[PDB]
Design a protein around this motif. Sequence first.
Motif, PDB file in Angstrom:
ATOM      1  N   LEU A  89     -33.011  28.361 -25.287  1.00  0.00           N
ATOM      2  CA  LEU A  89     -34.112  27.576 -24.734  1.00  0.00           C
ATOM      3  C   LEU A  89     -34.016  27.343 -23.235  1.00  0.00           C
ATOM      4  N   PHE A  90     -32.794  27.226 -22.725  1.00  0.00           N
ATOM      5  CA  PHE A  90     -32.580  27.085 -21.283  1.00  0.00           C
ATOM      6  C   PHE A  90     -32.813  28.409 -20.556  1.00  0.00           C
ATOM      7  N   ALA A  91     -32.320  29.501 -21.140  1.00  0.00           N
ATOM      8  CA  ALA A  91     -32.591  30.852 -20.639  1.00  0.00           C
ATOM      9  C   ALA A  91     -34.085  31.132 -20.579  1.00  0.00           C
ATOM     10  N   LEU A  92     -34.787  30.805 -21.669  1.00  0.00           N
ATOM     11  CA  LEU A  92     -36.241  30.970 -21.774  1.00  0.00           C
ATOM     12  C   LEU A  92     -36.999  30.222 -20.687  1.00  0.00           C
ATOM     13  N   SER A  93     -36.597  28.984 -20.413  1.00  0.00           N
ATOM     14  CA  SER A  93     -37.286  28.148 -19.432  1.00  0.00           C
ATOM     15  C   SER A  93     -37.142  28.678 -18.016  1.00  0.00           C
ATOM     16  N   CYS A  94     -35.922  29.073 -17.668  1.00  0.00           N
ATOM     17  CA  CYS A  94     -35.612  29.581 -16.337  1.00  0.00           C
ATOM     18  C   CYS A  94     -36.330  30.902 -16.114  1.00  0.00           C
ATOM     19  N   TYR A  95     -36.284  31.767 -17.127  1.00  0.00           N
ATOM     20  CA  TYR A  95     -36.938  33.066 -17.067  1.00  0.00           C
ATOM     21  C   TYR A  95     -38.448  32.956 -16.953  1.00  0.00           C
ATOM     22  N   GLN A  96     -39.079  32.215 -17.865  1.00  0.00           N
ATOM     23  CA  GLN A  96     -40.550  32.113 -17.891  1.00  0.00           C
ATOM     24  C   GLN A  96     -41.071  31.456 -16.635  1.00  0.00           C
ATOM     25  N   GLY A  97     -40.346  30.453 -16.147  1.00  0.00           N
ATOM     26  CA  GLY A  97     -40.719  29.752 -14.918  1.00  0.00           C
ATOM     27  C   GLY A  97     -40.748  30.672 -13.715  1.00  0.00           C
ATOM     28  N   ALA A  98     -39.720  31.511 -13.591  1.00  0.00           N
ATOM     29  CA  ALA A  98     -39.610  32.479 -12.489  1.00  0.00           C
ATOM     30  C   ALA A  98     -40.603  33.629 -12.640  1.00  0.00           C
ATOM     31  N   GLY A 144     -38.007  21.048 -16.813  1.00  0.00           N
ATOM     32  CA  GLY A 144     -37.517  20.776 -15.464  1.00  0.00           C
ATOM     33  C   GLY A 144     -36.922  22.023 -14.835  1.00  0.00           C
ATOM     34  N   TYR A 145     -36.101  22.733 -15.598  1.00  0.00           N
ATOM     35  CA  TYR A 145     -35.615  24.046 -15.190  1.00  0.00           C
ATOM     36  C   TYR A 145     -36.732  25.058 -14.929  1.00  0.00           C
ATOM     37  N   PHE A 146     -37.705  25.098 -15.844  1.00  0.00           N
ATOM     38  CA  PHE A 146     -38.915  25.923 -15.733  1.00  0.00           C
ATOM     39  C   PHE A 146     -39.599  25.684 -14.396  1.00  0.00           C
ATOM     40  N   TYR A 147     -39.969  24.433 -14.149  1.00  0.00           N
ATOM     41  CA  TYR A 147     -40.718  24.085 -12.953  1.00  0.00           C
ATOM     42  C   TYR A 147     -39.936  24.248 -11.651  1.00  0.00           C
ATOM     43  N   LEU A 148     -38.615  24.073 -11.710  1.00  0.00           N
ATOM     44  CA  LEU A 148     -37.764  24.276 -10.537  1.00  0.00           C
ATOM     45  C   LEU A 148     -37.708  25.753 -10.144  1.00  0.00           C
ATOM     46  N   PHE A 149     -37.520  26.632 -11.123  1.00  0.00           N
ATOM     47  CA  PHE A 149     -37.630  28.067 -10.878  1.00  0.00           C
ATOM     48  C   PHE A 149     -39.040  28.521 -10.464  1.00  0.00           C
ATOM     49  N   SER A 150     -40.076  27.838 -10.946  1.00  0.00           N
ATOM     50  CA  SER A 150     -41.450  28.172 -10.569  1.00  0.00           C
ATOM     51  C   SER A 150     -41.754  27.943  -9.085  1.00  0.00           C
ATOM     52  N   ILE A 154     -35.569  36.403 -10.678  1.00  0.00           N
ATOM     53  CA  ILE A 154     -35.791  36.702 -12.096  1.00  0.00           C
ATOM     54  C   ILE A 154     -34.568  37.313 -12.795  1.00  0.00           C
ATOM     55  N   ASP A 155     -33.917  38.282 -12.147  1.00  0.00           N
ATOM     56  CA  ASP A 155     -32.716  38.951 -12.697  1.00  0.00           C
ATOM     57  C   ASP A 155     -31.524  38.020 -12.943  1.00  0.00           C
ATOM     58  N   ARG A 156     -31.521  36.864 -12.286  1.00  0.00           N
ATOM     59  CA  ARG A 156     -30.439  35.895 -12.455  1.00  0.00           C
ATOM     60  C   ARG A 156     -30.705  34.788 -13.494  1.00  0.00           C
ATOM     61  N   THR A 157     -31.977  34.579 -13.850  1.00  0.00           N
ATOM     62  CA  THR A 157     -32.421  33.401 -14.634  1.00  0.00           C
ATOM     63  C   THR A 157     -31.843  33.275 -16.038  1.00  0.00           C
ATOM     64  N   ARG A 158     -31.801  34.380 -16.771  1.00  0.00           N
ATOM     65  CA  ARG A 158     -31.275  34.373 -18.129  1.00  0.00           C
ATOM     66  C   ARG A 158     -29.798  33.964 -18.164  1.00  0.00           C
ATOM     67  N   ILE A 162     -28.008  32.294 -15.861  1.00  0.00           N
ATOM     68  CA  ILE A 162     -27.943  30.882 -15.481  1.00  0.00           C
ATOM     69  C   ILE A 162     -28.265  29.962 -16.670  1.00  0.00           C
ATOM     70  N   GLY A 163     -29.375  30.243 -17.352  1.00  0.00           N
ATOM     71  CA  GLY A 163     -29.819  29.465 -18.504  1.00  0.00           C
ATOM     72  C   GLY A 163     -28.838  29.447 -19.657  1.00  0.00           C
ATOM     73  N   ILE A 164     -28.307  30.618 -20.009  1.00  0.00           N
ATOM     74  CA  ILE A 164     -27.272  30.734 -21.042  1.00  0.00           C
ATOM     75  C   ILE A 164     -26.040  29.887 -20.706  1.00  0.00           C
ATOM     76  N   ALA A 165     -25.584  29.969 -19.460  1.00  0.00           N
ATOM     77  CA  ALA A 165     -24.386  29.247 -19.025  1.00  0.00           C
ATOM     78  C   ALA A 165     -24.548  27.720 -19.031  1.00  0.00           C
ATOM     79  N   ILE A 166     -25.691  27.229 -18.547  1.00  0.00           N
ATOM     80  CA  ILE A 166     -26.008  25.795 -18.598  1.00  0.00           C
ATOM     81  C   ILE A 166     -26.094  25.305 -20.047  1.00  0.00           C
ATOM     82  N   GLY A 167     -26.775  26.081 -20.883  1.00  0.00           N
ATOM     83  CA  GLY A 167     -26.961  25.736 -22.281  1.00  0.00           C
ATOM     84  C   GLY A 167     -25.677  25.680 -23.080  1.00  0.00           C
TER      85      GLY A 167
END
Lengths: 322, 313
Positions: free
Chosen positions: B168-177, B52-58, B187-191, B193-198
């Motif tokens: 895994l949250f960092a990975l999803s946000c990053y790969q999606g973007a 969901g994070y992946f696709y939202l960043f995509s 892209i520079d913000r995704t990791r 964001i993902g770390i903090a949510i996770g």
Amino acid sequence: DRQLWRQFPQVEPQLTALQDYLLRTVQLDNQPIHHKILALLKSGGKLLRPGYFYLFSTFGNAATPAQLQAGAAAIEILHVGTLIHDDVIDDSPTRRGVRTIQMTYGQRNAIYAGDFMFTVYFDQVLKSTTDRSLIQNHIDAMHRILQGELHQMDLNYREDITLDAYLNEIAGKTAELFALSCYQGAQLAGAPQSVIDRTRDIGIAIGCAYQMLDDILDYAGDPKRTQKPVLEDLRSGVYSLPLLLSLSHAPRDFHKLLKKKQAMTLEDIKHVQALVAQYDGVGAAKQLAQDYTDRALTLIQQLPVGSAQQSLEQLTRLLLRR
Amino acid sequence: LDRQLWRQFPQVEPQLTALQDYLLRTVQLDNQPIHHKILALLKSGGKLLRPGYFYLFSTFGNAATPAQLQAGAAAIEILHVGTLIHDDVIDDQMTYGQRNAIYAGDFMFTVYFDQVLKSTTDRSLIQNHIDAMHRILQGELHQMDLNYREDITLDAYLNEIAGKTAELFALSCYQGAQLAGAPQSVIDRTRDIGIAIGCAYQMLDDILDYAGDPKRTQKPVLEDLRSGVYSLPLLLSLSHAPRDFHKLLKKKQAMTLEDIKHVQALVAQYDGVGAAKQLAQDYTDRALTLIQQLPVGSAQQSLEQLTRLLLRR
């Protein structure tokens, strides 16, 4: 085992460098578990599958030493990682002389260590090549090794085990890494198509023969005296080549002894061993091993003439005749 | 924690719906014992939070084909399931249900790589997946060295949960973007964001161990304290009484059912639950602040809504 590569001057420095490279690729926070993986690597400097990789790389000129080193490390890392997991499933206390990881640190940590090696494996695969079909070929091989692990598991306690079923199993379980070695080495180096078209069949044949010789040594030797490897095999329901070739001669006699499974006694295995010796399962096995060996050797002889073919013959003969 | 959660984010609903079917097709296997173990974990995990994070960043990009994104989102879920299966083994012959678990996880790892390779031709993107799985399995192996540790710092807890959950949250946000070809500022913000949510997500899980009934005894905390895994509520209570806890914790597997009630009462006494709810909220705020720095619009909106739903509820 280490110093059989003395006989092989053109690849010994490549394999000496690889040992050091391999010990550097495993970097882990958990030092007790890091020491155990490294110890498994130190007691496996025979590096047979990397050996085949390097020998086949000599048929082309298109890969750098960094690419070859990564490709050869990948194979050995995939080997060691699957071993760690196989030792969990088989509940094995020892591997290459050293005590297995699960005995000393628990089953889950051993699984995690195996999983870790898969991450190092894929990292080396990427370091070896940019070519996407070569990467896919690694994935497909990993898939085939696991399929050969399940095929083994579905064959547990099965007395109707066919020769076909055994070949399909060991081709995934043992032979696939030899085939992957030969194929990646020749393809990275850009060998000619006639080398590439034969690597997998060479690898499959050598690997099939190599497994057969391990099964032979189970039932070989002293018949009236109990054997350590066979006892755990029979109770788990793994019926290796000399036994499975013997089942057809006397199906009811065997089923009597093997019905017991885990309960099988100390004297019941001696009966199984006596029967296998009576119907010459060991002898029949050696024949198949020799026929797979000869198929490998024949296919090596169809390769381009040179120092490479010669070395492949020497290595194959050293591995499979003695 | 719903499958129908994606009705509330209708931009990415068709693809997350499509991903459920795709995951089932991708996971098809000859061996029915293993195939059903995996199929049971996909049907209990129709939340698909990480995809969901992946696709939202995509939505911040349009470089990738639907097939590539789908492959990329599948890889993340497959990696998640694979590690989940291997977490369901025990420390310490070998049971039939456990041989299946090891093989099922290993199968998932091979399918993972297959989907990664299918999603991208870009080598740094593939390398990013490897490094992530590397960090997750590092952090999973690091848990062994943190068992039965009274003297563990707050920083080591943060590191542990960064690998185990946040990566895994960092990975999803990053790969999606990155796959979708989003601007580099996104892209520079995704990791981060993902770390903090996770990290906040894991904290919320550690809170729910010591929150139900302090007089009673709960199911998951039973194993944990005996195994030596100490949650955040407990870790923020160890300073208050390092003598008193050491008597109750060194028992380890030896702890009785009333040994652990004394630990549960002491955490209720020093209010570690409230001390951990502060940290969760700190990281929830940090996550929401970083999301506020993203370009204004629907994607930012949906990312806030999703993050609030995960952490404030």
